[PDB]
Amino acid sequence: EIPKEMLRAQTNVILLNVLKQGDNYVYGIIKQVKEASNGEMELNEATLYTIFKRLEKDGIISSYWGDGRRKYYRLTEIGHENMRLAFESWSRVDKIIENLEA
Amino acid sequence: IPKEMLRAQTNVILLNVLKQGDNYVYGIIKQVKEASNGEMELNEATLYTIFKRLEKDGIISSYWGDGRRKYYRLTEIGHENMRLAFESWSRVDKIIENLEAN
Ligand SMILES: COc1cccc2c1C(=O)c1c(O)c3c(c(O)c1C2=O)C[C@@](O)(C(C)=O)C[C@@H]3O[C@H]1C[C@H](N)[C@H](O)[C@H](C)O1
């Protein structure tokens, strides 16, 4: 079994990395992820929009419009910084664990 | 760093400790302190809080071994969950790298 809180986290990481590659709109994101996952992850629009409201509510991402009009989502600098801390944070965890194996 | 994220990390480390072998609270705090070379000094209360949840979820059990000490064990479900979870997160790493090919 896997904690649902944990799959929700993974999906967040993947999404944030997509915007890290560059700004994008929802349909392009699921497509990009569906491809990169070779088909195992078909994200549903409804739950995905639900997640993006939280991130914008956290200022981690912003949104805007551009044409063929589509609403694009941007990785904010605050989002950029948080991702750095998180990866650096999680990097220390991997080191803690490796030491434990001694 | 999200406090939510530190609790997850703290959970991962503790479980990886018990994967090394059954242990008691002060032994676990010591092992983590050493493995982090002093950067993570967990207080007794936080482990009890976390272990109460894990014991209730069947992820760990406890037992008295001797000079009395309360030992904590990672159950079979816990091992499987750690296995499944680590497999899970490994899949994410590929999805992301594929995104960079994209
Ligand atoms: C891109 O880095 C991240 C950025 C933000 C959040 C995260 C992560 C992240 O990498 C991450 C994980 O790698 C892992 C987890 C996680 O929550 C995050 C993030 O939240 C959860 C996990 O600890 C389990 C088993 O629950 C396993 C996994 O670590 C992997 C690699 C470790 N070296 C260790 O072997 C562990 C058991 O599995």
Residue numbers in the entry:
A (entry chain B): 3 to 69, 74 to 108
B (entry chain A): 4 to 69, 74 to 109
List sentences from the manuscript.
LmrR is a transcriptional repressor regulating the expression of the multidrug ABC transporter LmrCD. In the apo state, LmrR shows high affinity for the promotor region of LmrRCD. This affinity is reduced upon binding of a drug at its drug-binding site, enabling expression of the multidrug transporter. LmrR is a homodimeric protein with the drug binding site at the dimer interface.19 Central in this binding site are two Trp residues, W96 and W96′ (residue 96 from the other monomer), oriented face-to-face at 7 Å from each other.
To investigate the importance of π–π interactions for drug binding, the electron density in the π electron cloud of W96 was modulated by progressive fluorination of the W96 indole side chain. To assess whether the Trp analogs influence the overall structure of LmrR and its drug-binding pocket, crystal structures were determined of LmrR with bound Dau for LmrR variants 5FW, 5,6diFW, and 5,6,7triFW. The crystal structures belong to the same crystal form (space group C2 with very similar unit cell dimensions) and were refined to resolutions varying between 2.55 and 2.15 Å. Although the crystal structures show generally good geometry, they all suffer from high crystallographic B-factors (average B-factors for protein atoms varying between ∼57 and ∼89 Å2), indicative of static disorder in the crystals. Nevertheless, the electron density maps were of sufficient quality to identify the Trp analogs at positions 67 and 96 in both polypeptide chains of the dimeric LmrR variants. No major differences were observed in the backbone and side chain conformations around residues W67 and W96, compared to wild-type LmrR.19 Moreover, as shown in Figures 2 and S6, the binding mode of Dau to LmrR is not substantially affected by the presence of the fluorinated Trp analogs. Dau is bound in the same way as in the wild-type protein, with the aromatic part of Dau sandwiched between two Trp analog residues, stabilized by π–π stacking interactions. Thus, we conclude that the different Dau binding affinities observed for the LmrR variants are not related to conformational changes of the protein or significantly altered ligand binding modes. The binding affinities of LmrR for Dau and RBF decreased upon increasing degrees of fluorination of W96. Dau behaved less extreme, with the kd decreasing 6-fold.
